[PDB]
């Protein structure tokens, strides 16, 4: 029972099963020692279990989060918690923290035919959480410990450049909460090269964390383009239960009055990204969150300078069409009717996906896009072709994103 | 050209074609006189046309609205308007304002084989507008002239009772803007029987208008139950281009914490009403309007008494499931998964339909439902079975609806 | 236990359970006391169970279904020498079902308290007790009349004018001492017999969504007229509940839109098929499951139209068209005729309405004989659009006969049950 | 504008083009001469169109039908009758119904290049008239207006036998039995292999006025059923009945029992595109009634007994002959549709009949109880009495 | 556990139940005696199951297959072989393959009530073994592992003729030609009507080791095609080829040209439920190559000329024989699929072959140019050379 209690038993049974297995395996490599099926059947290396009931892992990492939710039940429901051993063995690939010193084909087949491996045919159960922690590091090029609870998603490396910039000067100012910058390379920064000409080549979703003492900083992930890996990153960032993730990206404005550099606030999404159709049908509505919508509207106002509802000029609120087909223009004729029915105000390739994932995993979400092109009105040009109007508004766009996270953290 | 101009030509050519036809027909009844095909081919009785371009009707009725939009283009675009005669004849059934003195089968077939009738195989063109004006009167039991721009939709005759109550005492108070009450019976009221034990039998969607000098009062329509005639009423009320219509109804609460009498603010809709699937697919998102959402939230706060965000107790915001199958409970098992995916917070039979119609016709919309039952938690009972908790909150519910219209009119 | 004894026990037992629960609730509303887990685990307020042999079911309101239950129980008892068992079951009656209609609703010490310590409704022969109470609780509300007044022959109408005619005919019918119709149960609680003063008022449309009217006979074999409004929703709804009363037949008598050039307002349409565009039943009965027509009902409706109307051969051949009826949930279907045109053509649609297919599909689902006899009140595709209740002399003058045919078919059908 | 000669006028314009076409091509094959391109546009080969507007063809055999059709339009509303040339040239292959070419693709390379090719109106009926004679071992001129459909050789035999019994006895109205393979039997004659030479052989039992029975043995599956009806439709039959065997789905019914369809569960798939499965196909009351009577009589049931061997319900037509291998899946639908019997051509004949305005019905005989683990001449006689009954009330 | 006797052990358990079953029912029909209910549970009628787990039946003919299968499991991994009784009773109708009952529904009312009824494992293969002999005029014991599929009687004849030429000449390996209708021809003998008695007749050209060709003439449409394959599959053929005619869809190709399928546009509908149309059906390279070779040889093309008469592409199989009547609709898809020819059974044989792991291929001959307005023995010979070639590399 009790808060501070069980939480130590978890770490106990956890590190208990982890080293047991890490050893058993070593005992098998250059020896061939088989683990005792009895001690195993009793939990030689099984994931800690906790009831009040689902198995957990890396309790030390989710330490804080587990307490914040632990006593928040004890001190008002009088429930007991009998942390013990579950009936789910930890897959060995997860106990080899770091890299894996390979063996030959026969040895590896033995690991498979004798020890516990991954089992597809099986919220957030110990196994699913470990699955996403493994990948998250690989995709982002950073440790899971540095991840902050307020994340920003971008599709322009220019934005990462700025972030790291702003993030360093912030580490230098003693009046700033930010004390360090975890970079996709695996380097820490404190009080000129945080950007590596090797992160992009090595990680397809490089992240950058602006850490704070209390662990309430800003994390930025460059998810790249497309609904597919926008869905990917979210499947994983979900296990760290973020407070909110915002899509700060570029889009094609679909209305006449829009100007390159204007902003779009999505209050609905036309889901033509396909990727999540089987686990969340296109007819299941994904609403906007009043809190984030307001933080976004306010931040645009604050940073913009547009007095009161003057923002109404360069800031439109409407539905966004997210598609997995970048060259939709080749098929405008077909898309025309759906764009008209949905009164679409803009089109991009990640928004809806991010929003729906936020919706699926109960993670607050929002999208603030920047018009960087006008496909149906001539004036054709996308990010990277010298649009002084869009480029000359990236800092501004990124600022808005940060102000918003500020407004949200304030609550 | 010009505002005050053309607007008089419209009424001119209109009343011109209307009497011409009304006469021509009389000339045919007890005479058999055929109208001159030449004068006809030149516009003996054709709908006034207006370009800057779509045909119009009853210009006198849409007088105000046509000006508000007329000069609002002249005084800032320097465009000319050549009102003339269109190439669309007015169907005779519309020129017989009131009732139709019948003839025999041979005479009626002659009207058909010789004069202009309704043509299905053909925004808001003269013909479609006349179609809806004809029906609107019949369905509501009131003249089209009394309709106010702020309408309320209810599904409980109890609410109409209250409205008429409150509406009469308001006509008496000289400090009230309201100067009269147009009743579904066809009676006017000024400064004890506005409710007729014959309106409900004669009209399936009785309305009640609380008129004002400036014509900015509150109109209430009892649409009945079901998505089908919720779609019906809207197809018509659209031609009078209302400023907003709100669904003030009862619903089944789907969450445990909800209490009979609580309120639900829809921020999204699970469209299982089917009725609008062919003209607006279930995957086309219907967002909420920030203005109405706020007017509704504020009004609930104001009238409720719940301090600040205390409303959070008896007021939930979430997606609503609208269905055309009232006995959904017989099929809970099937509906379970979709209710869970959509995180449904309540279920009713008109909301989504009203919202989508509002969305289709660019008419601001919103829904404030009152939990009058809890299907998945025992505590079973619907409106009319003596729920002192729901009934003892109808005035309150109706007040909220009115406060909201007040907040919206204030803008 | 003999059939008649099985019914007496079901009654005594049911009433015992109802009363036990009403009482236990009063003790709670006052002394704040509640029932014992033991007494309940035995069956303090539990529905009785009826078993035969091995089929078994829970039963509710036995007195209301006595004739029905007796008929089925007698059959298997005498003809198959079956054994009948009656006794407590393991399903408690949900307290709302013992309240009746209205109750003493006060505070949270009630609403929340009741469902906390007493039996509530938990979703997850043909129909079991809870399923039947569900529908029984609502018929009352929807129709404005006691469930025990419903007759086994039902007539569904979509226009108030039919109710007017039905009530006239009925009133003048109970006034004829050699007629089987003895009383007229009206929506609102009004009961009309011979020794009744002022039968003229026999406001119901304000208080009830689908008011009903019953012309009862000494043996419950009269005629029930339910005026369902408009649309597939309500049709589906009323039928869900009306099915538990196990009706002999339900007929849809109402107006429709004739879709053929040669049709004349006032003409009749005998449906022999349905293009289901009502959507309301797609999930539980896909549109590809055919809804056939019942030969005996077709025959009764065909024969009644002839007899009652007096139409001779050729007149019948033209005024009484028999084909496919399309039912839609979109009243303003005209606004998009192009889209509908194609479907109408493939189905050789003879008419379009808003409740037909739904009624028939429901009858099909619940094994209740069904049929449709509509009357053309306008011609949407040929220059005569009109909403029921406007100036339309030819149709209004057709209503009385249309009703008579419906009553004749029922009379003809009741007469064939041998 | 005269409903009579007008049929003869159009009749003239047909040979006026048939002769022209044959001649023109008879030349090219020899002399190599190509017809005047101007003569073509003039209307050298086109069909004789009509107006009251549509082209026609083979007015010869369609005389009765045609005359007995236009008259209803004249002596009942007096309509303008127009009979001239059309802008549609007859396809050269529909004109080889007189001779029999043996050339080749090259010796035809010009036939397609120069002469008019193929690329209910005239072109439509021609398409069917052609094939119709190939699928059956008979000429279109022998087809009777009352058709029976079968899928069991035992019925053809049982039929050919019965026919002859009637073909000789002067009392009967049946004069000659047109057989599959160009054969022709008359009262003055004596008593094969059509099954190898024809996908779907037929056997007509002609009469003076041509109001006798005609039996076509369709293949199996809904493909053939649809196919044969597309062509037959062109002769405007008065009614066609599917009389076949089926698997009984109810515990009650016994092998030999009859099933009368009152609805169809269409799993035949073949007509889904032109007629979506949600379109309902009703049963014809008079045909339903005929089959019922024909059964009551020929069976020997007083008027109730019949219901112990006769069953009315919804039939399921599938293109999956081995549907049993996956009944687990079918089950829900069979239950939902309260299925009574299952076969492979019924709904298809019914639906096709419904599309071409041809009265239809099906009388099936249970030949297997697939869900339970478990007469011919009579079955056929029933079809006959039903046909003859329907002919009477007509 | 001995891969040999084990096949004989299971073989024993079969007759151990076949004999039992027949006996038991031979009694009831006479004495009226019902078998010990305890004897049944004991395993009186059940099938001889296997484990290495699945029942088996008719191990007799399946000896070669069976032995030559278990061995691969022993001499390659040494697996436990279990051969005992199963919990599945043999359906009484699958045992009437010795006698021939003539009773009736009532005289069988008990057969179903008392005895075991019908309500790839054992029950499955039995289902096919039965029917397979009814659809073809031949016994399952004469089926060769190399099958050819046809839809044109001209091919059977062309085939039966050729076979005999080989059946007599001692040099050839073909010894006897099993014919449709129980007929059996040998080098010592002389030289019909199967077409009337069988939906799909077959004609085997047996050899000592039973590695000869076998020709089945399937009906028309994909229903028959699917149906025949469901049963044939049970004999585990080595390969079956569809050699039929088709309509050419390309301006180039000429009547008589050949079409080799490299993909299928499935509009046959019949296999949509068990194998959704989005599942791709690939072509077998070795079979594609065989047909290509067989064509190059038998045609007389040096190694290029062939491409002027031979075309490889995607075939469209439809259940709509008169698809032309609505080509307007088909057009988009034919274009999208770059369709080359259209037929009614190809994709169906292909898909079915793909489901049962049976090498497949189709060689079609253009017999019509429907979109343009416009050899047999060779076609058949090609099929042969392809078959014989594939037999060689095996």
The DSSP-derived string for D199-235 is SS-EEEEEETTS--EEEEE--SSHHHHHHHHHHHGGG
Residue ranges of chain A assigned to CATH 3.30.1730.10: 1-121
Residues of chain C with CATH 3.40.50.1580: 125-418
Tokens representing D288? 């339903």
Residue ranges, CATH 3.40.50.1580, chain B: 122-411
CA angle A239, A245, A250 (to 5 degrees): 135
Instruction: Count CB-CB contacts under 10 A for residue C153.
Output: 24
Give the whole-angstrom CA distance, residue A48 versus residue D194.
Answer: 80
Query: What approach was used to elucidate this structure?
Result: X-ray
Find where tokens 């492979």 sit: D344
What's the CA angle centered on A21, arms A18 and A22, to 5 degrees? Answer: 80
With beta carbons under 8 A apart, name residues in chain A contacting B366.
none
Q: Note whether C119 and C164 are within 8 A (CB).
A: no
Rounded alpha-carbon distances, angstroms, from residue A171 to A188, A220, C133, C134 = 11, 16, 70, 67
Does C160 touch chain B if contact means CB atoms closer than 8 Å?
Answer: yes
* Residue owning tokens 């308001």: B170
Task: Give me the long-range contacts of C185-188 (CB less than 8 A, separation at least 24).
Answer: C185/C145, C185/C146, C185/C149, C185/C213, C185/C214, C185/C215, C185/C216, C186/C144, C186/C145, C186/C213, C186/C214, C187/C143, C187/C144, C187/C145, C187/C211, C187/C212, C187/C213, C188/C144, C188/C145
Closest to B282 measured CA to CA, from D143, A285, C62, D393: A285
Do the two chains A and C touch, given a threshold of 8 Å on CB pairs and at least 3 pairs?
A: no
Please tell me the distance from the alpha carbon of residue A338 to that of residue B283, in angstroms, as a whole number: 10
The 3 state secondary structure assigned to C347-383 is CCEEEEECCHHHHHHHHHHCCCCEEEEEEEEEECCCC
Mind telling me how many Å the CA of D316 is from chain C's nearest CA? 11
Name the burial class of residue C255, with classes exposed (0-12), middle (13-18) and buried (19+) by CB atoms within 10 angstroms of its CB.
buried
Residue E196 CA, chain-centre distance (Å), reads 21
Residues of D in contact with C275 (CB under 8 A): 278-280
Q: Burial code of A260-285, b = ≥16 C-beta within 10 A, e = fewer?
A: bbbbbbbbbbbbbbbbbeeebebbbb
Q: How far is B235 from chain A (nearest CA, A)?
A: 17
Chain B within 8 Å of A274 (Cβ-Cβ)?
no
The residues that bridge with B322 in the sheet, in sequence order, are B271, B348
Chain B residues touching residue A312 (CB < 8 angstroms): none
Out of A293, A317, A319, name the one closest to residue B285 (CB): A319
Contacts of D278 in chain C (CB under 8 A): 275-276, 287-288
Interface touch B378/C120, C-beta < 8 Å? yes
How many residues appear in chain B? 411
Q: What's the CATH number for D1-119? A: 3.30.1730.10
Task: Give the tokens for residue E200.
Answer: 């799909």
Q: Answer whether C51's CB lies under 8 Å from C84's CB.
A: yes
Q: What is the 3-state secondary structure (H, E, C) of chain B?
A: CCCCCCHHHHHHHHHHHHHHHHHHHHHHHCCCCCCCHHHHHCCCCEEEECCCCCCCCCCCCCHHHHHHHHHHHHHHHCCCCCCEEEEEECCHHHCCCCCCCCCCHHHHHHHHCCCCCCCCCCCCCHHHHHHHHHHHHHHHCCCCCCCCCEEEEECCHHHHHHHHHHHHHHHHCCCCCEEEEEECCCCCCCCCCCCCCCHHHHCCCCEEEEEECCCCCEEEEECCCCCHHHHHHHHHHHHHCCCEEEEEEEEEECCCCCCCCCEEEEEEEEEECCCCCCCCCCCCCCCCCHHHHHHHHHHHHHHHCCCHHHCCCCEEEEEEEEECCCCHHHHHHHHHHHHHHCCCCEEECCHHHHHHHHHHCCCCEEEEEEECCCCCCCCCCCCCCCCHHHHCCHHHHHHHHHHHHHHHHHC
Residues 6+ away with beta carbon under 8 Å from C164: none
Cα–Cα distance measured from residue D368 to residue D354, given in angstroms and rounded to the nearest whole number: 28
Q: How far is the alpha carbon of E72 from chain D, nearest alpha carbon, in Å?
A: 30
* Chain B residues whose beta carbon lies within 8 Å of the beta carbon of residue A271: 283
Among candidates C164, C165, C156, which has minimal Cα distance to C374?
C156
Instruction: Provide CB contacts within 8 A for D213, sequence distance 6+.
Output: D144, D146, D147, D148, D204, D205, D384, D387, D388
Query: Which CATH number is C125-418's, of 3.40.50.1580, 3.20.20.70, 1.10.3210.10, 3.30.70.1290?
Result: 3.40.50.1580
What residue of C is the nearest CA neighbor of D272?
Answer: C288
C-beta separation of C73 from C9 below 8 A: no
CA gap C379, C397 in Å, rounded: 17
- Cβ separation E372–D220 shorter than 8 A: no
> What angle, rounded to 10 degrees, do the helices at A126-140 and A228-237 form?
120
Cα separation, E112 vs E101, whole angstroms: 14
Pairing type for strands A263-272 and A315-323 reads: parallel
- Answer whether A342 sits within 8 Å of B288, measured CB to CB: no
Helices D376-392 & D153-168 angle (0-180, nearest 10):
60
Q: For residue E263, what are its two tokens? A: 């993909």
Give Cβ neighbours of residue B238 (< 8 Å, ≥ 6 apart).
B124, B132, B357, B361, B363
Query: Which residue is associated with the tokens 């009944």?
Result: D327
CB-CB neighbours of A2 under 10 Å: 11
Q: CA–CA separation, A273 vs A353, rounded Å?
A: 7
- Angle between the B228-237 and B351-360 helix axes, to the nearest 10 degrees? 30
Candidates D346, D363, D376; CA nearest to D295 is D363
Report the run of H or E that residue C396 belongs to, with start and end: helix C393-396
Show the tokens assigned to E368.
């019509």
D positions 179-198 inside 8 Å of E (CB): 193, 195-197
DSSP D165: H
**B29, two tokens:** 């009844």
Residue of D nearest to E271 (CA): D320
Facing residue for C324 by CB, picked from D276, D277, D282:
D282
How far apart are the C-alpha atoms of B374 and C120, rounded to whole Å? 11
The residue written with tokens 């379009």 in the block is: C352
Interface touch E105/D222, C-beta < 8 Å: no
Grouping H, G, I as helix, E, B as strand and the rest as coil, residue A358 is helix
Contacts of residue B70, defined as CB under 8 A and 6 or more positions apart, other chains included, come to: B3, B6, B7, B81
Please check whether residue C315 is in contact with residue C332, taking contact to mean a CB–CB distance below 8 angstroms.
no
DSSP letters spanning C274-333: EEEE--TTTTTS-TTS-----HHHHHHHHHHHHHHH---HHHHHHHEE--EEEEES-TTG
Distance CA A35, CA A101 (A): 20
Is residue A298 within 8 Å of A410, Cβ to Cβ? no
Residue whose entry in the numeric block shows the structure tokens 């829809």: B266
How many CB atoms neighbour CB D64 within 10 A? 10
The half-sphere exposure of A190 on its side-chain side, counting CA atoms within 13 A, is 2
HSE-up of B176 (CA within 13 Å, CB side)? 19
B178 DSSP β-pair partners: B212
Query: What is the DSSP pairing of strand E146-150 with strand E239-248?
Result: parallel
Q: Looking at chain D, which residues constitute the CATH 3.30.1730.10 domain(s)?
A: 1-119
Please state, in angstroms and rounded to a whole number, the distance separating the CA atoms of residues A90 and A101: 19
- Answer whether D314 sits within 8 Å of C290, measured CB to CB: yes
Instruction: Look at strands D46-51 and D82-89 and give their pairing.
Output: antiparallel
Q: Give the B:C interface size as CB pairs under 8 Å.
A: 155
Q: Residue C195 burial by CB count (10 A; 0-12/13-18/19+): exposed, middle or buried?
A: exposed
Compute the nearest-CA separation of D125 from chain C (Å): 21
What span, in angstroms and rounded, lies between the C-alpha atoms of A78 and A126? Answer: 25
Query: Chain C within 8 Å of D285 (Cβ-Cβ)?
Result: yes
Looking at CA atoms only, how far is residue A263 from chain B in angstroms? 18
What subunits touch chain E, counting only 3 or more CB pairs under 8 A? D
Max Cα-Cα span within chain E: 75
CATH of domain A122-411: 3.40.50.1580
Beta bridge partners of E360: E240
Closest to E356 measured CA to CA, from E212, E111, E60, E147: E147
The verdict on domain C1-124 having CATH code 3.30.60.50 is: no
Angstrom distance (rounded) from CA E144 to CA E238: 9
Q: Which residues make up the CATH 3.40.50.1580 domain(s) of chain E?
A: 120-394
Is the pair D, A in contact (3+ CB pairs within 8 Å)? Answer: no
3-state secondary structure at position D41: helix
* d(C-alpha B163, C-alpha A51), whole Å: 54
Cα distance between residue D218 and residue D136, in whole Å: 9
Q: Identify the sign of the CA torsion C204, C205, C208, C212.
A: positive
CB C59 within 8 A of CB C69: yes
Q: How close A400 gets to chain B, by Cα (Å)?
A: 20
Contact E186, E167 (CB under 8 A): yes
Residue D171 distance to chain E (closest CA, Å): 33
Cα A408 to Cα D324: distance, rounded to the nearest angstrom: 62
**Tokens at residue B95, please?**
């020129």
For C368, phi then psi, to 5°, come to -110, 120
Residue with tokens 């007496």: C8
> Phi/psi zone of residue C248: left (φ > 0), alpha (ψ -120 to 50 degrees), beta?
alpha
Chain D: touching chains (3 or more CB pairs < 8 Å) = C, E
Residues 6+ apart with CB under 8 A from A209: A142, A146, A147, A148, A181, A182, A217, A218, A219, A220
- Comparing CA positions, the residue from A129, A3, A137, A132 lying closest to residue A58 is A129
Q: Does B367 touch chain A (CB under 8 A)?
A: no
Alpha carbon separation from B74 to A256, B6, B69, E155, E295 (Å, rounded): 21, 12, 9, 84, 80
E120-394 belongs to CATH 3.20.20.70: no
Contact B332 C124 (CB under 8 A): yes
DSSP secondary structure code for residue A86 in this structure? E
Q: How far apart are CA A13 and CA A22, in angstroms?
A: 14
Helices C399-414, C295-309: axis angle to 10 degrees equals 130
With beta carbons less than 8 A apart as the criterion, state whether D206 and D174 touch: yes
DSSP A100: -
**In 3D, which of B152, B318, B317, B140 has the Cα closest to residue B247?**
B152
Axis crossing angle, helix D346-355 with helix D222-232, rounded to the nearest 10: 30
Q: Decide if domain A1-121 falls under CATH 3.40.50.1970.
A: no
Residue pair E251/E283 in contact by the 8 Å Cβ criterion:
no
Q: Is A1 exposed, middle or buried (0-12, 13-18, 19+ CB in 10 A)?
A: exposed
Of E287, E298, E303, E291, the C-alpha closest to E375 is: E298
Identify the closest residue of chain D to E221 by CA–CA distance.
D223
Rg (CA), chain C: 24
Whole-angstrom Cα distance, residue E368 to residue E246? 7
| C-alpha triplet C29, C32, C36: angle, nearest 5° | 110
Q: Find the angle CA(E86)-CA(E92)-CA(E98) to the nearest 5 degrees.
A: 110
Which chains are adjacent to chain A, needing at least 3 Cβ pairs under 8 Å?
A: B
Distance CA C178, CA C217 (A): 12
Please judge whether C105 and B278 are an interchain contact, meaning their C-beta atoms are less than 8 angstroms apart: no
Which residue in C160, C230, C381 is closest to B229 by CB distance? C230
Interface subset of C 70-99, CB within 8 angstroms of B = 94, 96
């Amino acid at each position: 029972l009790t808060p501070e209690q069980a939480l130590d038993r978890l770490e106990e049974l956890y590190e208990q099963s982890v080293n047991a297995l890490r050893e058993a395996i070593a005992d098998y490599v250059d020896n061939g020692t088989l683990p005792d099926p009895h001690a195993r059947l009793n939990g030689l290396f099984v994931y800690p279990s906790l009831s009040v009931t689902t198995t957990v892992t890396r309790p030390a990492l989710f330490r804080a989060y587990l307490l914040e939710q632990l006593n928040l039940v004890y001190h008002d429901y009088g429930a007991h918690i009998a942390v013990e051993a579950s009936h789910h063995e930890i897959p060995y690939p997860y106990v080899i923290d770091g890299s894996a010193l390979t063996l030959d084909r026969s040895m590896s087949a033995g690991l498979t035919r004798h020890f516990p491996t991954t089992e597809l045919a099986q919220h957030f159960d110990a196994r699913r959480v470990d699955f996403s922690l493994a990948r998250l590091r690989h995709y982002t090029g950073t440790p899971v410990e540095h991840f902050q609870p307020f994340v920003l998603f971008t599709n322009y490396t220019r934005y990462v450049d700025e972030f790291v910039r702003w993030g360093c000067s912030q580490i230098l100012d003693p009046d700033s909460p930010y004390i360090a910058l975890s970079c996709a390379g695996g380097i820490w920064i404190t009080a000129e090269e945080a950007i590596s000409d090797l992160a992009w080549k090595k990680h397809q979703m490089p992240a950058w964390h602006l850490v704070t003492a209390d662990g309430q900083g800003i994390t930025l992930v460059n998810i790249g383009v497309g609904p597919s890996n926008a869905k990917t990153i979210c499947d994983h960032l979900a296990v760290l239960r973020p407070d909110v993730w915002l899509m700060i990206g570029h889009c094609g404005g679909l209305r006449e009055s829009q100007a390159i550099g204007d902003y779009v606030l999505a209050h609905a999404y036309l889901r033509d990204d396909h990727v999540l159709d089987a686990v969340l049908p296109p007819d299941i509505p994904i609403p906007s969150i009043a809190e984030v919508q307001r933080a976004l509207y306010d931040a645009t106002k604050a940073v913009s300078g547009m007095p009161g509802e003057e923002v109404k000029q360069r800031l439109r609120t409407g539905t966004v069409v997210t598609t997995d087909d970048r060259n939709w223009e080749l098929r405008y004729s077909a898309s025309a009717l759906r764009f008209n029915l949905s009164r679409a105000v803009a089109i991009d390739m990640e928004s809806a996906t991010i929003a729906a994932q936020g919706y699926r995993f109960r993670v607050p979400y929002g999208t603030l896009l920047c018009v960087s092109d006008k496909p149906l009105h001539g004036e054709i040009k996308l990010p990277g072709q010298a649009n002084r109007f869009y480029e000359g508004a990236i800092s501004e766009h990124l600022q808005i994103g940060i102000r918003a996270i500020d407004l949200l953290r304030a609550e």
